Each structure stands twice: as structure tokens, then as C-alpha cells.
Amino acid sequence: SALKGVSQDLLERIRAKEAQKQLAQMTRCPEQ
Amino acid sequence: MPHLENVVLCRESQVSILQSLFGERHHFSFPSIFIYGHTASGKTYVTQTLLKTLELPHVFVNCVECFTLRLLLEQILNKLNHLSSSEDGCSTEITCETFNDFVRLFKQVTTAENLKDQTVYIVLDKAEYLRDMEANLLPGFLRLQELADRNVTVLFLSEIVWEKFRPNTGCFEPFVLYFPDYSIGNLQKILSHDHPPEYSADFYAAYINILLGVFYTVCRDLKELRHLAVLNFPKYCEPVVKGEASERDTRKLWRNIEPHLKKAMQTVYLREISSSQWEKLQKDDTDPGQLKGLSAHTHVELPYYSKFILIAAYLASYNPARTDKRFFLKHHGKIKKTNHEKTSNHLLGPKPFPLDRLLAILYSIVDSRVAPTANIFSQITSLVTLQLLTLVGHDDQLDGPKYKCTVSLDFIRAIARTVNFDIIKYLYDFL
Amino acid sequence: ASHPFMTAVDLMEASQLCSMDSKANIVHGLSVLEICLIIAMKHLNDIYEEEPFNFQMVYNEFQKFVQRKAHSVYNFEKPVVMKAFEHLQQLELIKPMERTSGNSQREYQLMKLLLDNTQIMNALQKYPNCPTDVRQWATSSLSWL
Amino acid sequence: TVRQLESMIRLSEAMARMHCCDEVQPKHVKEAFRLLNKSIIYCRISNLIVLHLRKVEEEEDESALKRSELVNWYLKEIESEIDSEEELINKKRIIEKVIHRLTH
Predict the structure, then answer these.
(1) Where is coiled-coil annotated (chain B)?
(2) Among candidate residues C72, A5, A20, C69, the one with its CA nearest the CA of residue D78
(3) Residue B123 β-bridge partners
(4) Beta carbons within 8 Å of C67's beta carbon, 6+ residues apart
(5) How many CA atoms lie within 13 A of B234 on its CB side?
(6) What residues contact residue B151 under an 8 Å CB cut-off, 6+ apart?
(7) Residue C108 near residue B349, CB atoms below 8 Å
(8) Closest CA of chain C from D96, distance in Å
(9) How many CB atoms lie within 10 A of CB B323?
(10) Distance of alpha carbon C133 from alpha carbon D3, whole angstroms
């Protein structure tokens, strides 16, 4: 699986990489 | 113990109920106990074991074997004088027919020390055919405690529910007991208890779980799987005898048995599937087109001038008596009514047709001419015994009787494809 | 031999077993064949306002539910339909208009129902093991093919 | 007949028109195949699960356990298409509910 089976970290940093770039684009500003 | 609880492991809430109503010998109960169940076999097998364990005076009679009230009240006393006292009564018979004298002669028999202050059980097997006779024998057992004044408890083992035999003037309201249904968690354990000495416990119970998940949606009684799992043993233990499969292997035996179950799971509630179904295919070395065993009615042997009788009579029982000129004289003028579709035509049943229709349609299906001799009309009455056409209730005279149909077009298409014939293009409902 | 006194527990359980719905507990010990049958005539009663109907009309909708489903092993054959409907004959769940024809076959029955449109819906959440693709068909009024 | 078959080919041709795909793919023609079945009419979630496991359990040359003690074996062929976010924690307790249809 993912939690109890294999792929404990291979399928874990996928969401961490996507959540890291979203916190850096918060200053995108709508009117820009 | 071997047949009281091991048969059904879901009676833990019913043993304390029946034993509480018994008590001792000088204890009484209701004069009638109505207990209805399912399959008419689960409540019957448990009765023959529970009564034969505590050693109590009880008899077993049936209302289906006798259609008269004179024979029903006679068989009760025939099985009572043998156990009325410590010795036999010289094998003497009882001559009676009056229903009023039944409560008088029963008191004289229940006078000895064996049936003086003891509970007598009267088990009425199949108690769902009592409404066919008279409407007076139903309240007779409900008020037997007041008339006979004896410790008599009448038992009922019928399939019909209680609220269906209510008389016109009412009767006594007793206790209605309902046995629990066959649970899914308890039916798996009762089907694996009767294990043969050739196997074990864990090795034999694994072959039952693989058949319960596929037969739960099509069957529910436990007696059906008891006689079916035994027949599948000779056709499943093949790799075990040959030695190609060792013990403990439930993940490799389902692949080879999968093609062997696709041609056997579609015949539920049918004990005909045995060792004679595949035997018919061995005698068909020449032209295996004939089907004998699995749907043998589709491929049967019909005479030349008789195979067209069932085909021509099928259209005469689902078509109007006027809109029939479209298949003979095409020089008429059609109106086009709609060319409504969900009407009752071809769905209500066979229409009553005389003999004038058959005398004008068999001359068009055949090729050359046919002379209606003696052997031509012989297929009209001979097919009545063969169960191929029904009669309009009572028997008619001779001035053109009326007939109907019986079998649909389930096998008509198979015969038509052998003598070069097409019936699909002749139906009126399919435009 | 283990009840020295009385309480309010031995009197409440004895009054419930003699007052339950005896016309709704007989459907729990069934399979899926006869369960789908009693629901089939329920849908036909909404479109046919009080009028008899035979058994061949139930066979028309039997091959209608086989669609919108993946190819598996749930499909049946044909003789199982009459065997599943005959099980309700010995249970007296259908009643003729007034006459039972002797020469009637497996097509002319014009039977009806002996239930109601209230206890049939309340006996679905208490039935053990209810499939997801079957319960949705019973609640809806047949809007798909 | 022929008038409706030529229209289905145009649906698969125009399916990959917005995805900027040159050659057609079998995963794009089956999209319009479902609309043809529902043309004459949370249940939709249970439909894409049955149609997915039927195309996987028909190619294994061998057979192991993967019955009751190995319930995580059926998650291998499905996690390959998962590449979002909420399909890891929220959908974790949903897999044990869909598999209950066979258990009962």
C-alpha cells in the first residue's frame, strides 16, 4: 500500500513539493 | 445433541423457550401452539429429534394423506393405543366417524396411569390444507382444553402464516412462535460439520466457503447445499487422486475448476443434474448437433407433417380473427393503423381458436399439396396427451371445438433452422 | 431456577415477540432472486393503477436490468426465473382474481400482490447484506435503461 | 447503423483536439463510449471502480494469496494513476469500503 505497505517516502514528497510552491506564490496578487 | 443443535447452530434462543413450556409431567400448556417456519424442513427435522430425546408421549399425523375427516381422527387413535398403557390392547381397532364422539372416546383412552397426569403432544404435520374441507375443524383444537379437559398440546408445523386461517366467527388466540432465519455466519458452520473421514477439519471447510459466495444469491435453504456439495466431490477431487496438487492449496484449485462450474451453476433447485447429463454426449459420436440432457426439449424428434402443426397453431392464438389476410391475399387495401405497441396483444395469453383457422394455413407453409387423410388429423388429439395444447375448460362437442396453446417460441426457432424455415418474419407483433 | 424476584425486564421482552410485523420479517430469510421479484411488481403497480397482470410481464424487465453493468458472472439463464417465482406460490404471497385455471401454464396467471407500499420500503435498511447496485434500483422509479 | 458509426469516430478524433495530442489513444475513445450507453436516461464513483478492476484480473499467468491477508495488493495497479493530493488520506479509508461488496 502506501501507509502500511511500501512507498513510505516515494509517495510522500509528491504532496510536499506541490505544497511548497503554493506557499511561495501567495504574493502573486490578483491585479498583477 | 448430535441432531438437536449440530444441525442448526442458531437455536440458542429457542431451546430455553420450548423447555420452559414443558416443565414436568403434571405441567400444562396451551391447547394449540402455532409455529410456522421456512422450507418446511428446518422445523420438522428439529421436532423429530427434540421429542425423541426427552422420551415423551407424542404422535405424528398428516392432513395431506387423508382428504376426509373420518380418516384423520382414526389415525390418531391408531398410534395412541400402542402407548396408552404399559401393554398392548390386544391390537383392537376403533370404528368412529362422528366428530362429536372424538372427544368422548379420547377421554376413555387417556384414563390409564401412563396418560393420567402427563402432557400429550399432537404434532400436525403440514397444517396448511385444513381450509379445503370444512370451516368447523379449525376451532376444534383451539378449545380442546375445555372440552376434553386433558393435558393435550397440539403442535403446528405449517408454512403459511397464522393470519390466514381466521374463521368467520373467530377462534382462540394462542401463541405465535417464529424461529429465527438462517444466518449467514451460522450457515457456514453447519454445512461443514458433516465432514467425511477421508479428509480433516480445516482442509474440508475450505471447499465450502468457495461455494457459499456464489450460491448465496441463488439459493438460501441449507438442505439444498447439503445434497449438492456431495455431487461436486467426484468432479473436484481429481488433482488430489492424481497427486499433482499437495495439501493446503486453496489458491490454485479455483483456476482448473472454473470452466467446470460455468455449465452447472445455472441449474439451481434441480436434482436432475447428476451422472447422466454428460453421459448422453457419449452416445452422440455422429452429428453432435442433438442436445440431450441440457435443454433436451429444444432438439427433439418431430414428424414431417407434425412439426408444422406447432408452428402454424402458434400464430392462431395471438392474432385477431380478422387481420389475417396480410399473409395470403396481398391484393387487399391496407389502412396503416400505426405503421399501440405496448398493448395486451401477444401478452395476455393464447387466444381461443376453433378448427377453421388450421384448415387454411397448413396449405401455405408446405411446398406441395397435402391430402387431409386419417393420419393428417391424428396430430390434433395425439398432441393433447403430449401436453402441447390446452382445451377451453370443459370438453366440447364435435361441431368444431376450440383450442389454445401451451409452449412459446423457445424451441420453434431451433426446428425451423433444420428444415429451412423462418418464423420470425411471420409474427404480427414484430412489424 | 435463577430468578428470585421480578423486574421490568422480563415483561417487556415477552410483549414484543407477540406484536412484531409478521408480514415483514419473512423477507429476511431470502436470497436476491425472490427479493428482486417483489420489488419488480411494486414498480409495475405505480404505472398500472389497479389492474391484474400475468407473470410474462415480469420477464420483460428482467433482461432490462442486465444493461449498464460490466460483463461478469451475475447474469443468469432463463429457467431460474420461473423457479424463483414459484417459491412465492407456496408462501401464499399472490392471490388469483377468483379462479385458478387448471390448464394454465407458465404465462397465464393474472396474479396480483398481497402486500402494501409502506412496509416494503421500511424493510430495506434492516435486511442483512444489501448490495449497492440493487438498493438504488428499488428506491428509484426506474429512470435508466 | 452507418450514420451513427461515422459520428462516433469524429468524437474520438475531437476528444484529443483540446489536449494537443497528435495520434489518437485508446484512453480517449472510451470516454465517448460511456455517453452512448447513458444517452437514453455518488453512484458514478462506484461505476469507475468495477470497470477498472475487470481489466486487470484477466492477465495474471499465476495466482497467489491476495485474498484476505493481502488486501493491499489491489492498491498497486491503481496508485500509478494517482498523482493529486487528497487521494492519499481521505481516500485511504474508502478502499476498505468498496472491497466490502465482495465480502459481505
Answers:
(1) none
(2) A5
(3) B60, B155
(4) C145, D37
(5) 4
(6) B26, B27, B28, B29, B117, B118, B119, B120
(7) yes
(8) 15
(9) 11
(10) 34
Q: Per the CB < 8 Å rule, is B217 touching C90?
A: no
Pull the grid cell for residue B85. Answer: 398403557
B54 φ, ψ to 5°?
Answer: -80, -5
CB B206 within 8 A of CB B41: no
Handedness of CA C68, C74, C76, C82 (dihedral sign): negative
3-state secondary structure of B423: coil
Q: Rounded distance, CA B323 to CA B271, Å?
A: 46
The DSSP secondary-structure symbol of B351 reads: P
User: How many angstroms separate the CA atoms of B57 and B115, rounded?
Assistant: 8
C81: cell is 426465473
* Three-class DSSP category at B138: helix
| Cell 458472472, residue located | C73
3-class DSSP assignment, residue D99? coil
Closest by CA position to B204, among listed B144, B165, B247, B264: B247
Interstrand relation of B175-178 and B58-62 (parallel, antiparallel or unpaired): unpaired
Contact residues, D window 69-98, toward C, CB-based 8 Å cutoff: none
Q: Which residues pair with B152 in a beta bridge?
A: B120
Mutate to test the interface with C, among D35, D37, D53, D57 (most CBs of C within 10 A): D37
Q: What is the DSSP string of B378-416?
A: HHHHHHHHTTSS-B-SS---SSS--B-----STTHHHHH
- Tell the burial category of B151 from Cβ atoms under 10 Å away from its Cβ (0-12, 13-18, 19+): buried
Instruction: Measure the CA–CA gap between B11 and B5, rounded to whole angstroms.
Output: 7
Residue tagged 424476584 (cell numbers): C5
Strands B120-125, B58-62: pairing kind: parallel
- B269 by DSSP, 3-state: which? coil
Of C133, C136, C143, the CB nearest to D41: C143
